[PDB]
Amino acid sequence: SLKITEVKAHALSTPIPERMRVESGAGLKLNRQMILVEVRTDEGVTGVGSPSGPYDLAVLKRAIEDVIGPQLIGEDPANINYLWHKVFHGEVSRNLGHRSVGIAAMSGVDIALWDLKGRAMNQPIYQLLGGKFHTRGVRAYASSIYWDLTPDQAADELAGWVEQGFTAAKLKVGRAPRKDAANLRAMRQRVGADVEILVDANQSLGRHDALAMLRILDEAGCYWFEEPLSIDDIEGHRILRAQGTPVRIATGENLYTRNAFNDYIRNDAIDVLQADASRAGGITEALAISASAASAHLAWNPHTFNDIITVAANLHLVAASPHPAMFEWDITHNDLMTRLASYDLKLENGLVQPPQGPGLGFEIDWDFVAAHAWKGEPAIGAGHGMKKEGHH
């Protein structure tokens, strides 16, 4: 058996041209960043992973290398189930907080342990997980069409993504609801009924404006309403789902561990769980959340937005899971989607395929890694939520 010898966290940053920066309720994007986790062993088998973002890269590096890492040195990396609980109970729940950047830090390390296990077996992760459910491929959506567009501009962007071969795309809303509505109406008129239109408010609305928005999403035939309210208001999400519309209420990028999703389920407050393998606790935890969603006759469609590793880790689980695919694919300017690894966007009839090599299924460009060390750049400007909080 192997022994883990080191847990490393490489802070990386890549720039975005000013005119390509986009804004949602999460804030104005400034640089696309990540931590590349590397777990090394005594026989030279290495796994890599990512704890998503944006968080703060110094906080993630310290958590991974100095809080979680020590609990792993000397251990057999094959016992990923044991190591997840050893780290959660030993340190991270109490000492970084139970719904925290520490859970995202664990997620990066858990993805690297799964990558390491697939490489040790010479199999792609989806094969360990029981092989494909989606044998034809996984239906993707273009993420996303951002704020600051007129309705003809939002419809032209959607149409462009449809032309590139997507069959679905997502619009960010929440700052100017009359304008969001006009964007949706123009987008639906442009593409017709077979392209799916998803909407994401990044927690920017209150309950009454979310109810008014849901009526427009229902009229426009939208597939889901993501983060319509603060993730802290579970009853508001039940109220939106209780309207009985065909529009799914979706959340989960900012909820952590299966415990959060069980509280939404128990309160009849969710249709689509969006737990991200790279944020909500790892592949090990997202596996459990996907199964709990199916048990409650709901769907799991992860958030995937940060880098090609968070995309690939979720894509292995989505391909192996019995849920309808609605697979998030970042189409914004992001070198971590094109230059870190050899696995790229390739759509055929609106579907992507999981990488096919061992582990996550591709190799890292270590020369790109070495050239993009973080030097203190910010990832994202201040996020929103003060308006709906009540600040004029």
Select from 13, 32, 55, 281 the one that contacts its own copies (CB under 8 A).
55
Nearer to its own copies, 45 or 78 (CB): 78
Which residues have a Cβ under 8 Å from the Cβ of 324 and sit 6 or more positions away? 139, 299, 301
Select from 211, 345, 347, 369 the one that contacts its own copies (CB under 8 A).
211
Residues 212-251 that bind its own copies (CB under 8 A): 212, 230-236, 239, 242-248
- Pick what 3 binds: its own copies, Na ion, none; C-beta below 5 to 8 Å, kind-dependent: none
Residues 233-292 that bind Na ion (CB under 5 A): 253
Residues 293-322 that bind Na ion (CB under 5 A): none
Check if the beta carbon of residue 13 is closer than 8 Å to that of residue 334: no
- Nearest Cα to 1, choosing from 124, 120, 115? 120
Shortest distance in whole angstroms from residue 146 CB to its own copies: 16
Nearer to Na ion, 227 or 285 (CB): 227
d(CA 100, CA 60): 11
Check if the beta carbon of residue 283 is closer than 8 Å to that of residue 304: no
Residue type present at position 385: G
- Pick what 302 binds: Na ion, its own copies, none; C-beta below 5 to 8 Å, kind-dependent: none
Q: What is the sign of the dihedral through the CA atoms of 107, 129, 267 and 221?
A: positive
Nearer to Na ion, 200 or 307 (CB): 200
Query: Does an H or E element contain 299, and which?
Result: strand 299-300
Residues 103-162 that bind its own copies (CB under 8 A): 103-104, 114, 117, 121-123, 127-137, 139
Nearer to its own copies, 157 or 350 (CB): 350
Check if the beta carbon of residue 301 is closer than 8 Å to that of residue 324: yes
- Nearest Cα to 200, choosing from 229, 226, 222? 226
Q: Verify cis geometry, omega within 30 degrees of 0, for the bond prior to 54.
A: yes
- Pick what 200 binds: Na ion, its own copies, none; C-beta below 5 to 8 Å, kind-dependent: Na ion
- Position 2 contacts its own copies (CB under 8 A): no
Contact region with its own copies (CB under 8 A), list: 35-43, 59-67, 154-162, 183-191: 59-67
Residues 72-101 that bind its own copies (CB under 8 A): 76, 78-82, 84-86, 88-91, 93-101
Residues 308-337 that bind its own copies (CB under 8 A): 320-325
- Position 23 contacts Na ion (CB under 5 A): no
d(CA 301, CA 328): 8
Shortest distance in whole angstroms from residue 144 CB to its own copies: 16
- Position 200 contacts Na ion (CB under 5 A): yes
- Pick what 248 binds: its own copies, Na ion, none; C-beta below 5 to 8 Å, kind-dependent: its own copies
How many chain residues are in contact with Na ion, going by CB under 5 A? Answer: 2
Contact region with Na ion (CB under 5 A), list: 192-200, 232-240, 283-291, 343-351: 192-200
Q: Given the structure tokens 């950047």, which residue do they identify? A: 101
Which residues have a Cβ under 8 Å from the Cβ of 10 and sit 6 or more positions away? 35, 36, 37, 38, 369, 373
- Pick what 372 binds: its own copies, Na ion, none; C-beta below 5 to 8 Å, kind-dependent: none
Residue type present at position 187: M
How many chain residues are in contact with its own copies, going by CB under 8 A? Answer: 118
Select from 256, 305, 343, 362 the one that contacts its own copies (CB under 8 A).
256
Shortest distance in whole angstroms from residue 92 CB to Na ion: 18
DSSP-assigned letter for residue 23? E
d(CA 254, CA 290): 16
Shortest distance in whole angstroms from residue 218 CB to its own copies: 9
Shortest distance in whole angstroms from residue 380 CB to its own copies: 7
- Nearest Cα to 317, choosing from 143, 188, 70, 127? 127
d(CA 78, CA 360): 16
Torsion of CA 231, 236, 239, 244, to 10 degrees: -30
Count CA atoms closer than 13 A to 159's CA, side-chain side. Answer: 14
Binding site for Na ion (CB under 5 A): 200, 253
